[PDB]
Structure 1
Amino acid sequence: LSHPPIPIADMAEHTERLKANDSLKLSQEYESIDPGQQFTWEHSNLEVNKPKNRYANVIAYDHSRVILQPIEGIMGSDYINANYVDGYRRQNAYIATQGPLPETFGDFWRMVWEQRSATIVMMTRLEEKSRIKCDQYWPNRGTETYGFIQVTLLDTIELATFAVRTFSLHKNGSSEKREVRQFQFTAWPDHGVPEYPTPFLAFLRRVKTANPPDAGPIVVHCSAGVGRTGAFIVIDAMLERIKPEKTVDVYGHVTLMRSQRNYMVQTEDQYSFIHEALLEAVGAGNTEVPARSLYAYIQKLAQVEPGEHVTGMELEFKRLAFISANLPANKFKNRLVNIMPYESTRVALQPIRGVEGSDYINASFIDGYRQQKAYIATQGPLAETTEDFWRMLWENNSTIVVMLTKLREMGREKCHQYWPAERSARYQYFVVDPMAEYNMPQYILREFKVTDARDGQSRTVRQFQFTDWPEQGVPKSGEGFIDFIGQVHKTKEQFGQDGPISVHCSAGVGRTGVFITLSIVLERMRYEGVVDIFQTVKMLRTQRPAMVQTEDEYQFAYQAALEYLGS
C-alpha cells in the first residue's frame, strides 16, 4: 500500500527519481516512515539502567529487547541497550546495540555468549574527529575478564578500511570455548555517509562469508546502534532478498526496523546511501576467486560465450562503467582536460599566500591493501608542474616515485624530464642532487638527495622507472613487472618509508592503475589466497577516474596474478 517493492530492473530509475530536485521525494518518503504503533521502554528507564544507556534518548523497546539472564541479587542485571532486528525472512537475524560503555562491557560479552552470536559488526572507529564514539570493550592482547566471560584475542588482521579480530570466549566452570569474530569497518566518514559504497560492500562481503550459517544473531553496533547500524542491516537484508526475489523494498524494511528499535536509519543521507549501495551491488556480481580456481576462472573469461560476440574478460571490464581541477588558473596544470582528480581524494598542496590555485596538482590519494593513502596516482609532470611535483612529494613525505613511461614513446613526448642528472637543480625551495643511476634490464633506479633550502633539511628520494612496457599493448609476460613491483616495495620497507608511493605514467591512470592494482592483488593473494581483480579496480576508480584504462591492461592484471601464482 503506497510504497510497493522495486524490481531490481527499475532500481536505477527509482533511485534517480528520489534524488531529483535535491532529494525531494527521498526526503518525503523518509519522513513518512512510520511503524504506527506504541511501544514501551520501561527497562531502559529503570534508574539502575539509565547509566547503561550511552544516549538517554536512544532506548531499547521492551518487546524486542535482548534479555540477559539475571545475576542473583543484582537488580537490573537482565538489561542491555539492545534489540533484535529482522532481516529478509530471517527473524531476529541481527541484534542492534549501542557501543558498549565501560560499565557495560561485561553485559555486552554476556549478551554475545548467551545469544550464541559468532559475529560482531562494529560500524565505527573508537574515536572520530576527537569525539569518542565507542570505548574499547576487547583486550589489547591475550585474555581479559569481563563480568564472568574470559575474552581471548587470538588474532588481528588490519587492512585499509577495516579490521577483523578473532576471539575465543570461555565462561568459568564449563569447558565450553566459543569463537567470535569482530568485523570493524573503519572507513565511514566523520561527517555524512561514504561517497561511494564500494568499501562498505566489500566489508559486507567479508562479514557474510565469515558468519557461520548456524550461529545466533549477528551483533551490530556503532555509537548509538541505530544509524550506521541501520544501514548495515538494511543493505544486508536486501542483498539476501534479491537472491530468491529480484525486488527491493527499502521503505518496507526500514518501516519494519522502526517497530523494533527506535530511529533505525537515523538520517536521510543514510537512507540515500542504502539505495546507492544496493544499486551498485546489483551492478556487479561475484568476481572473487580462490587461488586454486584462478586459472579456470581466467580460462572461462577467455571464452566468447554462446550468445555474446566478445570474451567474458571484456564483458567483466565493461561492467566497471572536479572543482579545483577546473579552476581556470589550474587548467594549464592538467595534461588532459578529461583526466582530473576528484575533489575528495585530490592531493592538495600547502597553499602559497597570494597565488590562487597553488594548492592544486593533478594527483589523487589512493588506498593500498593495508593502509589508506598508500599511493599517490598523478600524471607525468609538465615542465610547468615540475616544481609543484617536487613540493607535493616533500609536503606529503613521499620518497618513492614510480615512473611507468619512457620520456618519449611512439614519437610523442609522454613526460617532461622533471629530474636533474648531470648536475644539481633547484626547483623552488628544494635542491635536488642526482646521487646515482642504476640500469636494470627492465627499469632504471635513480636516487636523489632533496634539500629543503628554507630550513636546510634533507631526504633521499628514489625513482623507479620501468622501461620495458611495450609502446603498444602490454607485456607478454608479467615476470618483469612482478619483479619490478617487488623491488619498489622491498625498497619501501627496507628504508622504512611511512609515506605514500607516488606513481605516474603519462596521464597517470592506465599503467598507473595496473601497477597499483597488482600491488594490492598480489599481497592479497599472499595473505588471503583469493583474488578479485574487478573489485580492486572498482575501488581504485572510487579514488581516481579511469584507473586501468583498457581491456588489455585489465587482462594483463589477470595474467600477472596468474603467473605470480605460478611461483
Structure 2
Amino acid sequence: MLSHPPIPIADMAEHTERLKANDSLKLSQEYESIDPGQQFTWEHSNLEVNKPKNRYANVIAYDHSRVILQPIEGIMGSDYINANYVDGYRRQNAYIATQGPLPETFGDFWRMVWEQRSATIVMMTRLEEKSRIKCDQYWPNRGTETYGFIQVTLLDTIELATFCVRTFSLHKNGSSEKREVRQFQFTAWPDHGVPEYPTPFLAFLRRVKTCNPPDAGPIVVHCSAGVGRTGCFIVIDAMLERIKPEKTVDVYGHVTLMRSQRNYMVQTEDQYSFIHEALLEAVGCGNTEVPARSLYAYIQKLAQVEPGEHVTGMELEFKRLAFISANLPCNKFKNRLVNIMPYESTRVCLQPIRGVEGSDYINASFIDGYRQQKAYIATQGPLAETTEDFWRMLWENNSTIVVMLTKLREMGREKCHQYWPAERSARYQYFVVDPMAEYNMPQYILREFKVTDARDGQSRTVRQFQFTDWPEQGVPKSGEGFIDFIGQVHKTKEQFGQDGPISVHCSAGVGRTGVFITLSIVLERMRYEGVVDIFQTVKMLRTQRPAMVQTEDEYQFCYQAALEYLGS
C-alpha cells in the first residue's frame, strides 16, 4: 500500500480534488476497494436470545472484537451487547462503536458504560429523524432512573443549536462508587445525506475532546446502527490526532482497519467523502478558542506584526476565512448586489404566488444562533422592488423583530429603501402596516408597527431597531453602544415573547449584519461558558450565507466588543 499510501497534509487538497473529480469516480473506486481481507465470526449476535438485542439484524458485532458484559447469574445471553472496540490513531480500543440502545437494551448499555469505565458517550443522531426512530431514549427525563443494576442521575443539560451536552452520575446498587459520565449529542446531521459543511461537526468534536477525561475507558460512540455516522466521528477524530505528531493522513488505511473491528464502518461513499471534507477544513484552521482570562493577551498577540510578516496576526486570521434560485434571470432584479446571493440550502423560501413564478424568492438566509437553529434571518436592505416581498417574508416566517444596521443614506448614497410607513398606514400587497411609535435613542431608533393580513384580518406587532451610530467609514471606536443595542434587541425577543427569527439587515446583509450576529452569539457564549472563538463563529456563519463579516476592521471590532463586554 502502495495503491493507497498516506497523504501529507500539504497534498490533502489536491488528493481530495482528484477523488471528487468526474463526479467522485476515483473516490468510488477507492471506497469500493476497501477490504480487511479476513473471515470473522458473529455467533453471539445470532443466538436466538440475542437477536432481539440487535436494532438491525444485518448489523452485528464480530466475536473477536465485541464488548463482553459480565454475565447475570442464571440468564443466558446476558454477556451480550451489540458493540465493538474500535482503534484510533496509536490508541488501541480507543472507542466503543455501538447501536442506538433499544428499550430492552437500556440496562445492557449502561452496564457496558459502567464495566468499561467509560466517561464519555458521543451520540451522533437525533432520537427521531424525518418521522423515523433512530434511537430510543436511554437516559432519564430528569433525576434518577434505574436501568438494570445501574442508577443513572441527570445532573445537568446544556442544549445548544447543533448539539446537547448532558452530565450524568452513575451508581451501581451495592457499590461505594459514583461515576460521572457526559453525553455529547450532535443534532445537526441532516435527515438525508451528509452535512453540506463540516463546520458544525468539527465544533462538536472540539467540545467532545475538551470534556473527555484522562484516566478513562473507551469513548462510547453511537448513532442508529453504530456504523455510518459513528464511523465518521471515529476516523475524523483519529486522523486529527494523527496529524499532531505526524502531519499525514490515511483515511483509507484507517477505515480498512475499522472494518476488521466492526461491520460496515463508514457505510456510504458520501460519508467517505464527508470525512475528507472535514479533515481538509480542520487542517486549514488552527485553534482560535480562548478562555475569558486569556482574551486580552490573545488580542494583544493578534495586534502584533510578527518578525517576517508584513501584516498583523488579526489580519492573517481574518484572511484564513477563505446558488441556483438567486441566479434565475427572473430574480436578478431582486438582488441589491449580484455577488451577494443566498445559498440554496439556507435561503428563506416564500410561499409561491399562483401566477408569478420566482415569487418564492427573497435575498435572505436562515442563520443559526447560540441556542437555536434559524435564530436569525440575514437579508439585504429592501429595494423598492422587494419591499412587498420583505413584509411577506416577516409574516410567513413569524419574524416580528427587525434589526436595521444602516442609515437610509450614507456617504451621499442610498443604502436602503425606506420600506416602512411613517405619516399614515400603507398597504404592501397583502399587508397593511400602521406606524404606531418612533423612539429616538442616542445610538438607535426603535419603530413599532401594527401589521394586518388583509386576507383574513389577523394582526401582529412588529418592532424595528435601526442602529444609527455606526460610522459611515470604518467601525465604532467603542463597542459600548453596539453591545447595548444587541442587549436591547434581545431583551425585546424575550419580553415579548418571540418565537420566530430576528431579521437582520444592513445594505447587502453580510457586513454589519455579520457583526451583529457574531456578537450576539459570542457574548452569550462568553457569559455561559467563559470562552470565545470569534474565528469559528464567523466560519460557521459563512456556511449559511456568504461574506458574513466583510472586512478586517469589522472582524477586529468583534474582538474589541468581546473584550469590552468582559471588562463590564
TM-score tier by shorter-chain length is over 0.9
Shift of 1:204: 0.1
Find the counterpart in structure 2 of residue 431 from structure 1: 432
Task: Tell me the SS of whatever aligns to 1:164.
Answer: strand
What displacement does 1:65 show?
0.1
Q: Secondary structure at the match of 2:466?
A: strand
**Offset, 1:291:** 0.3
Instruction: Give the percent of matched residue pairs that are identical in Structure 1 and Structure 2.
Output: 99
Q: SS of 1:543's equivalent?
A: coil
**CA distance in 1 between partners of 2:43 and 2:98 (Å):** 17
Q: TM-score, normalised by structure 2?
A: 1.00
CA distance in 2, matches of 1:447, 1:477: 28
What are the Cα deviations for residues 248-270 of structure 1, in whole angstroms up to 9, with x where unaligned?
Answer: 00000000000000000000000
In 2, Cα distance between the equivalents of 1:247 and 1:474?
A: 42
Structure 1 residue 19, shift from structure 2 partner: 0.2
Q: Matched residues in 2 for 1:61 and 1:8: separation?
A: 33
Q: CA deviation digits over 1:442-486, x for unaligned, max 9?
A: 000000000010010000000000000000000000000000000
SS of residue matched to 2:5: coil
Cα deviation, residue 214, structure 1: 1.5
State whether structure 2 residue 474 is matched by structure 1 residue 473: yes
Secondary structure at the counterpart of residue 542 of structure 2: helix
1:158 Cα shift? 0.2
Q: Deviations over 1:6-36 (max 9, x none)?
A: 0000000000000000000000000000000
Q: CA deviation at 1:133?
A: 0.3
CA–CA distance in 2 between the matches of 1:123 and 1:252? 23
- Structure 2 Cα separation of the partners of residues 492 and 101 of structure 1: 39
Superimposed CA distance per residue, residues 283-337 of structure 1 (whole angstroms, 9 cap, x where no aligned partner)? 0100000000000000000000001100000000000001100111000000000
Could you tell me how far apart the structure 1 residues matched to 2:403 and 2:360 are? 23
Residue by residue over 1:326-372, the C-alpha shift from the partner in whole angstroms, topping out at 9 and shown as x without a partner, is 11100000000000000000000001112110000000000000000
C-alpha deviation, 1:92, in angstroms: 0.1
Q: Distance in 2 between matches of 1:304 and 1:213?
A: 37
SS at match of 1:542: coil
Give the C-alpha shift of residue 418 in structure 1: 0.1
Cα distance in 1 for residues equivalent to 2:139 and 2:491: 34
**Per-residue deviation at 1:414?**
0.2
- Structure 2 equivalent of residue 91 of structure 1: 92
Which aligned runs of 4 or more in structure 1 are off by greater than 3 angstroms? none
Matches for 1:456-471 after TM superposition, within 5 Å:
456-471=457-472
**3-state SS of 1:199 partner:** helix
Deviation per CA, 1:503-535: give whole Å up to 9, x if none: 000000000000000000000000000000000
SS of the residue corresponding to residue 152 of structure 1 reads: strand
1:195-228 Cα distance to aligned partner (Å, 9 max, x none): 0000000000000000002210000000000000
Give the whole-Å Cα distance in 2 for the aligned partners of 1:244 and 1:343.
40
SS in 2 for 1:444: strand
Aligned partner of residue 136 in structure 2, secondary structure: coil
Aligned to 1:516: 517
Aligned to 2:120: 119
Alignment pair present for 1:16 and 2:27: no
Partner SS, residue 143 of structure 1: strand
SS in 1 for 2:330: helix
For the residue of structure 1 that corresponds to 2:543, the secondary structure is: helix
Q: C-alpha distance in 2, partners of 1:486/1:545?
A: 26
**Which has the larger displacement, 246-255 or 351-360?**
351-360
Question: Match for residue 318 of structure 1?
Answer: 319
Deviations 1:420-455 (A, max 9, x none): 000000001110000000000000000000001001
Q: 1:52: Cα distance to partner?
A: 0.3
Give the corresponding residue for 2:485.
Answer: 484
Q: 1:489-509: per-residue Cα shift (whole Å, max 9, x none)?
A: 001100010000000000000
Cα offset for 1:174? 1.1
Shift, 1:42, TM fit = 0.1
TM-score normalized with structure 1 length? 1.00
**1:175 CA drift (Å):** 1.8
- Provide the C-alpha distance between the structure 2 equivalents of 1:53 and 1:174, rounded to a whole number of angstroms: 29
- Structure 1 CA distance for aligned equivalents of residues 181 and 167 of structure 2: 6
Secondary structure at 2:93 match in 1: strand
Structure 1 residues 236-251: aligned runs within 5 Å: 236-251=237-252
SS of structure 1 residue aligned to 2:242: helix
SS in 2 for 1:287: coil
Distance in 2 between the 1:278 and 1:412 partners? 44
Using the alignment, how far apart are the partners of 1:354 and 1:500 within structure 2? 29
- For 2:13 and 2:485, how far apart are their aligned partners in 1? 42
Structure 2 Cα separation of the partners of residues 493 and 164 of structure 1: 24
Determine the structure 2 residue equivalent to 1:415: 416
Partners in 2 of 1:52 and 1:234 — Cα distance? 26
How far apart are 1:559 and its partner, in Å?
Answer: 0.2
Q: Distance in 2 between matches of 1:63 and 1:504?
A: 58
In the alignment, the residues of structure 2 paired with residue 428 and residue 93 of structure 1 have an alpha-carbon distance, to the nearest angstrom, of: 61
Question: What is the alpha-carbon distance in structure 2 between the residues aligned to residue 425 and residue 108 of structure 1?
Answer: 62
Other structure's SS at 1:240 match = helix
3-state SS of paired residue (1:544): coil
- Give the number of aligned pairs: 567
